[PDB]
């Protein structure tokens, strides 16, 4: 019931072409794995195809899928696309919602909170749609970040924690793992979607937790892992 | 950010049977220096057997028998470890004082008093590991409750509190302090948590999970 081998496996990553998502894909592509990589913005197609090209040279298969990924319909169609090309999904990873198009200085507390409500809704739909297209012994992982909590500095050590726990209970019979990782304060660049000492969480510290949870950490279920180095504020 | 697990000094309390033995075997894949505590003198031939098989993996092993029931004895374990190997890199507390009397002959008050001594020793373990530790060290405690095992009511607790406060305190010394709370295991220590699913989490936290700090990880299969 534990994965002896992670090859021939089907993996969906929402936001899988840059930042945490791309690093997560490279970590999985050490074995002969089937990656469907989602990306939000159509202009990032050359970054996606560059990554596709190097991951194919890692010995992995790569299907790309662009979408705004903002409603249940668009989320459903991501997993439809996944099933169409590789068959039923084994591992689904939600790494990022939509990023900031405005400077943080020019954004208010209400419009940050509204961005959270949208991202929470999409993450709920991601979990729901993953499971309906998923093999038994499968894994769902949401990367829990709050734009409002990052702006005000109030990090906890929460909707996605509630969706994670409730969905793990409901998918117990289907034998699907549902977990979340909540990183500590990160660099401003990631929330624009770009990339003194550092008390900041790096993506290099989050990616191997994702790989672990789907492999040797398979018994962790219903959990939100806070990975922040002990730093709760910035 | 560990480069290797090579040359590292690892202390395991309750290290010769069950989870501790498995933890020891997992770490001994690389060339480690292991200090394996065991509670009972009658388990010495089991200890020497495990020492033999871990030496045949490439690891150096020192055994240490102790009741481990107060701060003085916990201080002595780490003094021993520092004497034999130098400063500790990784300290694991797996165990807790086990049952002599059967479960049926044991009252709730006796289980509660066993948990209290275990909680106190867990506090002392973290405190005394920290005093003998290199920078970038790791302290891990396996959080179980004999009362919760007896009653069947599991939470998803003193050790969580100890873990949190110690990690805040040791922030400048660069020591991570973490706990793992497994679900219902077997009565000798399917919906049960196996030890084979717990020892990889111990190994991961010391390596690629190094950024996890101050946390209690609940590993119960969702049950």
Q: Give the C-alpha separation, B173 to B135, whole Å.
A: 6
Q: DSSP string of A105-119?
A: GG--HHHHHHHHHHH
Nearest by CB to B218, from A205, A206, A223: name it: A223
Are the beta carbons of B33 and B40 closer than 8 angstroms?
no
Across the interface, do A230 and B217 touch by the CB < 8 Å criterion? Answer: no
Q: Give the C-alpha separation, A100 to A94, whole Å.
A: 17
Are the beta carbons of B111 and B117 closer than 8 angstroms?
no
B-chain residues near A30 (CB < 8 A)? none
Q: Give the C-alpha separation, A100 to A107, whole Å.
A: 9
* Residue A100 CB neighbours (<10 A): 17
Quick one: B110 exposed, middle or buried, by C-beta within 10 A (0-12, 13-18, 19+)? middle
Structural domain boundaries enclosing A29:
1-234
Helix (H, G, I), strand (E, B) or coil at A66: strand
Chain centroid to Cα B189, Å, comes to 14
Strands A177-183 and A224-227: parallel
Across the interface, do B212 and A225 touch by the CB < 8 Å criterion? Answer: yes
Across the interface, do A222 and B219 touch by the CB < 8 Å criterion? Answer: no
* Residue B42 CB neighbours (<10 A): 9
Which candidate, A99, A195, A102, A180, places its Cα nearest to that of A147?
A: A99
Q: Give the C-alpha separation, B172 to B150, whole Å.
A: 40
Write down the experimental method used for this entry: X-ray
Strands A89-94 and A61-66: unpaired
Across the interface, do B208 and A208 touch by the CB < 8 Å criterion? Answer: yes
Q: Give the C-alpha separation, B223 to B209, whole Å.
A: 24
Q: Give the C-alpha separation, A17 to A46, whole Å.
A: 10
Count of domains for chain B: 1
Nearest by CB to A225, from B167, B197, B217: name it: B217
Q: Which residue of A has its CA nearest to B169?
A: A230
Q: Give the C-alpha separation, B24 to A203, whole Å.
A: 30
Across the interface, do A212 and B208 touch by the CB < 8 Å criterion? Answer: yes
Across the interface, do A212 and B209 touch by the CB < 8 Å criterion? Answer: yes
Helix (H, G, I), strand (E, B) or coil at A78: helix
Which candidate, A227, A185, A188, places its Cα nearest to that of A207?
A: A227
Across the interface, do A221 and B217 touch by the CB < 8 Å criterion? Answer: no
Chain centroid to Cα B113, Å, comes to 20
* Residue B117 CB neighbours (<10 A): 14
Which candidate, A74, A1, A108, A86, places its Cα nearest to that of A36?
A: A86
Are the beta carbons of B66 and B77 closer than 8 angstroms?
yes
Q: Which residue of B has its CA nearest to A137?
A: B221
SS (H, E, C) chain B: CCCCCCCCEEEEECCCCHHHHHHHHHHCCCCCEEEEEECCHHHHHHHHHHHHHHHCCCCEEEEEECCCCCHHHHHHHHHHHHHHHCCEEEEEECCCCCCCCCHHHCCHHHHHHHHHHHHHHHHHHHHHHHCCEEEEEEEEEECCCHHHHHHCCCCCCHHHHHHHHHHHHCCCCCCEEEEEEECCCCCCCCCCCCHHHCHHHHHHHCCCCCCCCCCEEEECCCC
Are the beta carbons of B177 and B90 closer than 8 angstroms?
no
Q: Which residue of B has its CA nearest to A179?
A: B222
Q: Give the C-alpha separation, B136 to A47, whole Å.
A: 36
Please give the torsion angle defined by the CA atoms of residues A219, A225, A227 and A231, in that order, rounded to the nearest 10 degrees. Answer: -140
In CATH, what number is assigned to the domain containing residue B107?
Answer: 3.40.50.720
The resolution, in Å, is 2.3
Across the interface, do B209 and A206 touch by the CB < 8 Å criterion? Answer: no
Are the beta carbons of B100 and B56 closer than 8 angstroms?
no
Sequence-ordered alpha helix ranges (H) in chain A: 19-28, 45-56, 72-86, 109-131, 147-152, 159-170, 189-192, 207-214
Strands B9-13 and A134-143: unpaired
Q: Which residues of A touch B (CB under 8 A)?
A: 2, 157, 168-169, 172, 177-178, 201-202, 205-206, 208-209, 212, 216-223, 225-230
Q: Which residues of B touch A (CB under 8 A)?
A: 156, 167-168, 171, 176, 193-194, 197-198, 200-201, 204, 208-215, 217-222
Q: Give the C-alpha separation, B110 to B6, whole Å.
A: 42
Q: Give the C-alpha separation, B49 to B150, whole Å.
A: 32
């Amino acid at each position: 019931t534990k994965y002896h081998d992670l090859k021939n496996k089907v993996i969906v990553i929402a936001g899988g072409i840059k930042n945490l998502g791309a690093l997560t894909a490279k970590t999985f592509a050490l074995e002969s794995v089937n990656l469907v990589l989602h990306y939000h913005q159509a202009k990032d197609s050359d970054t996606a195809n560059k990554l596709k090209d190097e991951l194919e040279d890692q010995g992995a298969k790569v299907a790309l899928y662009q979408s705004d990924l903002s409603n249940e319909e668009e989320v459903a169609k991501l997993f439809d696309f996944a099933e169409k090309e590789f068959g039923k999904v084994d591992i689904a990873i939600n790494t990022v919602g939509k990023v900031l198009k405005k400077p943080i200085v020019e954004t208010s507390e209400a419009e940050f909170d509204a961005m959270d409500t949208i991202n929470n809704k999409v993450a709920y739909f991601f979990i729901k749609q993953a499971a309906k297209h998923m093999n038994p012994n499968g894994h769902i992982i949401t990367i829990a970040t709050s734009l409002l909590a990052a702006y005000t500095g109030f990090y906890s050590t929460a909707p996605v924690e509630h969706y994670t726990r409730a969905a793990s209970k409901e998918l117990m019979k289907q034998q699907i793992s549902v977990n979340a990782i909540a990183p500590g304060p990160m660099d401003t660049s990631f929330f624009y979607g770009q990339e003194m000492g550092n008390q900041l969480t790096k993506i290099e510290d989050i990616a191997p937790i994702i790989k672990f949870l789907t492999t040797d950490g398979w018994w962790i279920n219903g959990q939100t892992i806070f990975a922040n180095g002990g730093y709760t504020t910035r």
